[PDB]
Design an enzyme around this catalytic site. Structure first.
Site, PDB file in Angstrom:
ATOM      1  N   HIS A  38       0.806  -1.211   0.000  1.00  0.00           N
ATOM      2  CA  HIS A  38       0.000   0.000   0.000  1.00  0.00           C
ATOM      3  C   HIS A  38       0.839   1.260   0.000  1.00  0.00           C
ATOM      4  O   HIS A  38       0.331   2.353   0.012  1.00  0.00           O
ATOM      5  CB  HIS A  38      -1.077   0.001   1.082  1.00  0.00           C
ATOM      6  N   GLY A 136       2.492   5.723  10.831  1.00  0.00           N
ATOM      7  CA  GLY A 136       3.874   5.511  10.449  1.00  0.00           C
ATOM      8  C   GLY A 136       4.425   4.128  10.748  1.00  0.00           C
ATOM      9  O   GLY A 136       5.573   3.839  10.384  1.00  0.00           O
ATOM     10  N   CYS A 138       3.408   1.038   9.735  1.00  0.00           N
ATOM     11  CA  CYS A 138       3.336  -0.041   8.759  1.00  0.00           C
ATOM     12  C   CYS A 138       4.707  -0.538   8.368  1.00  0.00           C
ATOM     13  O   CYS A 138       5.646   0.244   8.213  1.00  0.00           O
ATOM     14  CB  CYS A 138       2.614   0.423   7.513  1.00  0.00           C
TER      15      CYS A 138
HETATM   16  C1  LIG Z   1       0.470   2.099   8.424  1.00  0.00           C
HETATM   17  O1  LIG Z   1       1.248   2.939   9.111  1.00  0.00           O
HETATM   18  C2  LIG Z   1       0.149   2.529   7.223  1.00  0.00           C
HETATM   19  O2  LIG Z   1       1.154   2.492   6.001  1.00  0.00           O
HETATM   20  C3  LIG Z   1      -0.973   2.313   9.260  1.00  0.00           C
HETATM   21  C4  LIG Z   1      -0.850   1.861  10.571  1.00  0.00           C
HETATM   22  C5  LIG Z   1      -2.039   2.157  11.470  1.00  0.00           C
HETATM   23  C6  LIG Z   1      -2.213   3.647  11.685  1.00  0.00           C
HETATM   24  C7  LIG Z   1      -2.740   3.774  13.098  1.00  0.00           C
HETATM   25  N1  LIG Z   1      -2.271   2.549  13.730  1.00  0.00           N
HETATM   26  C8  LIG Z   1      -1.902   1.619  12.879  1.00  0.00           C
HETATM   27  O3  LIG Z   1      -1.577   0.490  13.170  1.00  0.00           O
HETATM   28  N2  LIG Z   1      -1.934   1.756   8.385  1.00  0.00           N
HETATM   29  C9  LIG Z   1      -3.062   2.248   7.869  1.00  0.00           C
HETATM   30  O4  LIG Z   1      -3.384   3.421   8.003  1.00  0.00           O
HETATM   31  C10 LIG Z   1      -3.929   1.302   7.038  1.00  0.00           C
HETATM   32  C11 LIG Z   1      -3.620   1.490   5.554  1.00  0.00           C
HETATM   33  C12 LIG Z   1      -4.352   0.536   4.613  1.00  0.00           C
HETATM   34  C13 LIG Z   1      -3.815  -0.878   4.754  1.00  0.00           C
HETATM   35  C14 LIG Z   1      -4.252   1.008   3.174  1.00  0.00           C
HETATM   36  N3  LIG Z   1      -5.343   1.541   7.258  1.00  0.00           N
HETATM   37  C15 LIG Z   1      -5.908   1.336   8.452  1.00  0.00           C
HETATM   38  O5  LIG Z   1      -5.308   0.824   9.394  1.00  0.00           O
HETATM   39  C16 LIG Z   1      -7.306   1.751   8.579  1.00  0.00           C
HETATM   40  C17 LIG Z   1      -8.181   2.332   7.700  1.00  0.00           C
HETATM   41  C18 LIG Z   1      -9.412   2.505   8.383  1.00  0.00           C
HETATM   42  C19 LIG Z   1     -10.658   3.040   8.029  1.00  0.00           C
HETATM   43  O6  LIG Z   1     -10.795   3.516   6.759  1.00  0.00           O
HETATM   44  C20 LIG Z   1     -10.499   4.886   6.535  1.00  0.00           C
HETATM   45  C21 LIG Z   1     -11.664   3.064   8.964  1.00  0.00           C
HETATM   46  C22 LIG Z   1     -11.447   2.555  10.250  1.00  0.00           C
HETATM   47  C23 LIG Z   1     -10.245   2.028  10.633  1.00  0.00           C
HETATM   48  C24 LIG Z   1      -9.226   2.006   9.688  1.00  0.00           C
HETATM   49  N4  LIG Z   1      -7.940   1.555   9.782  1.00  0.00           N
END
Ligand SMILES: *[C@@](O)(CO)[C@H](C[C@@H]1CCNC1=O)NC(=O)[C@H](CC(C)C)NC(=O)c1cc2c(OC)cccc2[nH]1
Ligand SMILES: *[C@@](O)(CO)[C@H](C[C@@H]1CCNC1=O)NC(=O)[C@H](CC(C)C)NC(=O)c1cc2c(OC)cccc2[nH]1
Lengths: 292, 289
Positions: A38, A136, A138
């Protein structure tokens, strides 16, 4: 106490991967760098389309001061395998494993390629982890270390609306029914890890609170029937054998500990505590108890 | 969640020191190795050391063997001089931590790091560690920036299961001596400033059930604190909790009135940040990080 594995062998592998303005963490082993796919993205994206639209030059990969150049790329499931011109001198002996629910591993929390902290967590039965992950994080990685070999088993991707975390193994297959999309996803109901709760209860007996013991008995079948009604995992015959050493050290048979737990599930604790808490702990494995 | 510092810069300084059949872990910085002095072992350590030749110290860095060039004793530590200077030594300081503060322990056995975890210096100068046989010489530290602050070297387990040790100058934390004696710490207390920092942490994460509309004064709070075996709170403590006060919008003495309720009424099976107990091993600095 929750102990983590020493994070050194994994710190040498943490890099920063940037596409345009979105950045995350990557794992640099040899000439290949792994990271959540992603990085190239948001709702329902077509990941093949966006990957074919991307040049090697688009990926900024920094490993500390150095910049590494993508000599190629490929997609494996939800992960990206960027080829790099440099092998990582600090790569450890390693393997990719698929961790199973009940089992534990250490997380090395990373931001901008810099390891921030290490903590130990377990993979729950609903295939989430109760982690501590900010924006941050991921590409931060979970791992176990046996001897000098590192078992990579988790790469961080998401945080469900309910506070818990979801990720994949090193082959990019997500643990659980999650997908990498900006959508709210629900985990299945979280059942309690019976094997670990019994390990805790054995740990409590070694520490000298026996108040929850009793003389009642149970068969495995009848304990499993109660347990499921309280959202506890059924106990396999394998799990019984695993508890063997804790059984002999305490002289309390496993089925008798289950009779004890069965009474706790059906009557609760009248505000009483075990090892200081009113709730039963379930992320201490039998190995953890034996080691300490 | 308790989080430990990445242990990488410390793991490269861990070595094994053996005198005869006695083994322990050592800290290899530059050309000197620090380790608890009882590796040479109620005796007299000045007598034991004079009878010791450099040749009798088996110091090993992983596969490699280091030759002890000279030595000297500072307090309860040996300073073994070696011919090789550790290529992996980080920037570092020795600091003496104050009670209430936290650090990471790299638990080591036979020179091999095996576990890392967070813990706090208790007000009675023990630490609630997880140390087993072979763990002496294990080290506590903080890794803020790139500089490692070594603050603890492990020496002992008390009859009660808590642990005791020294700074890297070799002076003990607390009343203990390095003898094979059962020894007792003082009565512990609960780290009030840490409990409040953790209450602020909960609010930031949204656990607000324990808040209330009341306020208390410092003197009235300490009247309740003393009765429940919490450390008195001071105005220095309140100033430390300033930045968390501002971030949450809850005045420091508002949070105290919430804590007095939790102490007086207890928590009715409800939980703050996951635990059923008031956590006191998270400092204000911790919660910011
Ligand atoms: C990574 O840092 C992203 O590269 C991030 C980690 C989370 C942020 C807060 N705590 C974490 O563990 N990941 C994300 O933001 C992912 C990205 C996806 C896989 C493309 N998305 C989510 O975790 C996410 C999206 C949503 C949502 O919609 C908008 C609604 C509710 C929850 C939610 N989580
Ligand atoms: C180091 O490994 C020492 O080589 C060891 C570490 C402890 C062993 C079990 N867990 C540990 O943390 N240290 C000791 O054995 C020290 C050695 C002293 C400083 C010379 N001794 C104790 O920790 C010790 C001695 C006694 C005792 O006596 C009699 C009675 C009760 C407790 C106790 N602890």
């Amino acid at each position: 106490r929750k102990m983590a594995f020493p994070s050194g062998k994994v710190e040498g592998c943490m890099v920063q991967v940037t596409c345009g303005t979105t950045t995350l963490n990557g794992l640099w082993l040899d000439d290949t760098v792994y990271c959540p796919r992603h990085v190239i993205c948001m709702l329902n994206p077509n990941y093949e389309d966006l990957l074919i639209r991307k040049s090697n030059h688009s990926f900024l990969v920094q490993a500390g001061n150095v910049q590494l150049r993508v000599i190629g790329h490929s997609m494996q499931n939800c992960l990206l395998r960027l080829k790099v011109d440099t092998s990582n001198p600090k790569t450890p002996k390693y393997k990719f494993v698929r961790i199973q629910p009940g089992q534990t591993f250490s997380v090395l929390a990373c931001y901008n390629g810099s390891p921030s902290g290490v903590y130990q967590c377990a993979m729950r039965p609903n295939h989430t982890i109760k982690g501590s992950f900010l924006n941050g994080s991921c590409g931060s990685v979970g791992f176990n270390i046996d001897y000098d070999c590192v078992s990579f088993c988790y790469m961080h991707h998401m945080e469900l609306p309910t506070g818990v975390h979801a990720g994949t193994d090193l082959e990019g297959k997500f643990y659980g029914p999650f997908v990498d999309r900006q959508t709210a996803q629900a985990a299945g109901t979280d059942t309690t890890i019976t094997l670990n709760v019994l390990a805790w209860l054995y740990a409590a007996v070694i520490n000298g609170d026996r108040w929850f013991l009793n003389r009642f008995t149970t068969t495995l079948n009848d304990f499993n029937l109660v347990a499921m009604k309280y959202n506890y995992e059924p106990l396999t015959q394998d799990h019984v054998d695993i508890l063997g050493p804790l059984s002999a050290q305490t002289g309390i048979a496993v089925l008798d500990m289950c009779a004890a737990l069965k009474e706790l599930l059906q009557n609760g604790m009248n505000g009483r505590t075990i090892l200081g808490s009113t709730i039963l702990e379930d992320e201490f494995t039998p190995f953890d108890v034996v080691r300490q």
